[PDB]
Write a protein that binds this ligand. Sequence first.
Ligand SMILES: Nc1ncnc2c1ncn2[C@@H]1O[C@H](COP(=O)(O)OC(=O)CCCC[C@@H]2SC[C@@H]3NC(=O)N[C@@H]32)[C@@H](O)[C@H]1O
Ligand SMILES: Nc1ncnc2c1ncn2[C@@H]1O[C@H](COP(=O)(O)OC(=O)CCCC[C@@H]2SC[C@@H]3NC(=O)N[C@@H]32)[C@@H](O)[C@H]1O
Lengths: 235, 229
Amino acid sequence: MLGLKTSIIGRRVIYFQEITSTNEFAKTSYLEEGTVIVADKQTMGHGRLNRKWESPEGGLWLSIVLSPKVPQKDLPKIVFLGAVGVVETLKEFSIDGRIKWPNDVLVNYKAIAGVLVEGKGDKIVLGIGLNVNNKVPNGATSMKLELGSEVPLLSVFRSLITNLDRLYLNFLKNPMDILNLVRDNMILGVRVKILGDGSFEGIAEDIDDFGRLIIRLDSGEVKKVIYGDVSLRFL
Amino acid sequence: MLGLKTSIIGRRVIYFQEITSTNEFAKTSYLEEGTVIVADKQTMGHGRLNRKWESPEGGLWLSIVLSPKVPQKDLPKIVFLGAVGVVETLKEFSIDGRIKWPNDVLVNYKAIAGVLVEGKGDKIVLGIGLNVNNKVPNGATSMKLELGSEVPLLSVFRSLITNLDRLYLNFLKNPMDILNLVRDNMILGVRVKILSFEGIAEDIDDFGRLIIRLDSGEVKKVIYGDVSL
Ligand SMILES: Nc1ncnc2c1ncn2[C@@H]1O[C@H](COP(=O)(O)OC(=O)CCCC[C@@H]2SC[C@@H]3NC(=O)N[C@@H]32)[C@@H](O)[C@H]1O
Ligand SMILES: Nc1ncnc2c1ncn2[C@@H]1O[C@H](COP(=O)(O)OC(=O)CCCC[C@@H]2SC[C@@H]3NC(=O)N[C@@H]32)[C@@H](O)[C@H]1O
């Protein structure tokens, strides 16, 4: 009855009034590629390293089952599909979302959405959390807070699913194409602190042909950052 | 993202752009009670006796998983829950639907919806097909044809699900109530043909059986079958 016209993402949608985590459900259950798992609220939503992701009613909490037939070295770019998808949807609603490498979307430097990809090969789960009309943690923001009015959640869902479907289809044909879109919508040219085994500061210059963040330290040394167990902070 | 506020029916909804049959999927898959299966279109939609139910885009084709711990004798009233639910939804949209025993809803004697209940031991599947904006077979009608304008399918879905949830919750407590709502909303006092024999459809009894008075004065009770008006 939703009348979705997408080719892959959204062929099937499983909705929950409440769930522990859409990513956990998606990873665990036997689901066809393109299946979208969405819930009004999550009781155990999570980000990277089991950090908690607040998921109250009013927001868009979903996961998408993917089985991308592309080289293993390209799988790390899946997170960008989610980030760009969110950015395109925000722009459709006249909200200036910008990417904080490699999985967050900010509006005026305040987090409005986060992406979490989990997947060991042939089954990849793309999780996306976007604050729409829900209350948010201090320092974060939402579409409602940005526009000054409630936003039809279903409309945001339709927009995002349509964008992701298109982005995914092109990714299957040309895995490298997404990098250009990320670059055009990413926060760059500013000082950042990279936190991992130790830490360093520098100018976030660009992302390379693999999606690695290129940082120029004051010494002139160039470091290529692989996203994994590393966080980025603005100075 | 649908923000459904129902208690049982609609706690979960599985949507398909296309499916063979929502009833078949519901029967062969393990689903929690209240799970709603809905699809834009069915390729093998069916009615009674494996009859085909046309299910093109534009209509509401769904199935609901139920597991009511009520007496076996009450299970035959589940079909009425679906029928009355449809009637209530139609009224919300200013349409007067009338039930044709035991599973059809008519508007000015033209079929606008059909109900199909199937019990699989570990669950009961309540299937409902309602013509909204889709093309319908000759002799049938739809909400669009009755109102003269496209009707938001999601609005109809929300309305029907809310009505069914309320009907079902009460049914679990007062199984008898549904019959009275059915009597108040079904086509009676008219001559019908049961398949055969003809007579006046007088009413439904405490078991939901159609009571027919033949011209001889004989009274027959129908448990199941097709009714031609
Ligand atoms: N609602 C919210 N809005 C903005 N920031 C939030 C937030 N809730 C938590 N945060 C902050 O963001 C951090 C998490 O950031 P990370 O970059 O690691 O992690 C993320 O940004 C990924 C979040 C992915 C969420 C979706 S919801 C659908 C699916 N089901 C799940 O269980 N997860 C996925 C936390 O440590 C908080 O400080
Ligand atoms: N779209 C339509 N609108 C009105 N009448 C139709 C119709 N499609 C077929 N018919 C006629 O209605 C008859 C079927 O009548 P019956 O009384 O036996 O059967 C019914 O009236 C029950 C139909 C139940 C349909 C739903 S769709 C969701 C779920 N998934 C399924 O596969 N089934 C359920 C056919 O023999 C046709 O003559």
